[PDB]
Design a binder for this molecule. Sequence first.
Ligand SMILES: [Ca+2]
Ligand SMILES: [Ca+2]
Length: 279
Amino acid sequence: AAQTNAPWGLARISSTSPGTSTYYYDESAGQGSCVYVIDTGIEASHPEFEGRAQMVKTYYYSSRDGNGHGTHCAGTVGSRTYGVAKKTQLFGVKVLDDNGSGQYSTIIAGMDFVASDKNNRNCPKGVVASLSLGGGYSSSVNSAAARLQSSGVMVAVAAGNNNADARNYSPASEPSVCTVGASDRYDRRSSFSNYGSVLDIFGPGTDILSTWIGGSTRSISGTSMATPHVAGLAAYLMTLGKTTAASACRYIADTANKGDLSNIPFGTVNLLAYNNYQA
Ligand SMILES: [Ca+2]
Ligand SMILES: [Ca+2]
C-alpha cells in the first residue's frame, strides 16, 4: 500500500533516503496488535481513529484529553492519515493532567495498570506501550518501565528534550526499554533531542503533523513525537510476525538505516527507524 503526500515522518520510515513524500507499508497495517498510549488521554471520538481508540483508565476527574499531547501521540501511532500502524487498536491511559504534568507515583501506577490490563484484552499479535514523557532520574520510575517490559509489552520511551545525556532522565535511562531520540526532515538530530549511550534508536520528531483535540490537527516537535513512530513500527512488525515484544527494539535497531544522521555525538547510535517495505 502507498499513501501519497504523506507526513514527512511516515515517508522517512519507509525510505532509505530523506526527501520523499510517499509512505509505503504492508496492508496488514498493525491489525490484531494493541498500543497503550500513556499520556494526557486520547480524544477517541476523533474521526481519524475510526472507532479503533478507547480510554481505559484515568487518574484524574475525567478521562478526556484536555491538553492535546496524548491525542497527537496516539495519532502518530495509529490514525488513518497520520499513523504508522493504521489498523492497530489504541488504548488510552491518562496519567498526565490537562497541563501535561503528573506525579511519578501516578505514572508508575499507570505502567503497572497496563501490565495487568493487557491480560483482559484481545491482542493476538502483541502489545505495545508508548511513553512520551519523563523527568529527572528516578530508580522507581525505571523499575516500573522494566516491569512493564518484562511482563511482555514492547515499551517505547522518549529520550527527552534537554539536548543532554539521557542517563539523567527517567524512564529514558532504563536500559531494558526502547529509548527514542528525535530527528528532523534533513536527517539532523533534532536540536532539542537528548543523546547518549542509552539511546536505542532515532525517529522523526521535528514538525510532526498529527491529530489534535476538537477534531483538529497540528504540527509540533519533540522526542514525544518520535516515540510513537517507533511504537507504531513495533506494532506493525509484530503483526507481520517479524519480531516479538521482547526483541522488537533490537530488531528495529538491526534493520534500521545506519549512518544517515548528522550531529550525532560520539557514543550515540546512528540508527533511524526503517520498515524495510518491499512491494
Ligand atoms: Ca540512507
Ligand atoms: Ca534500551
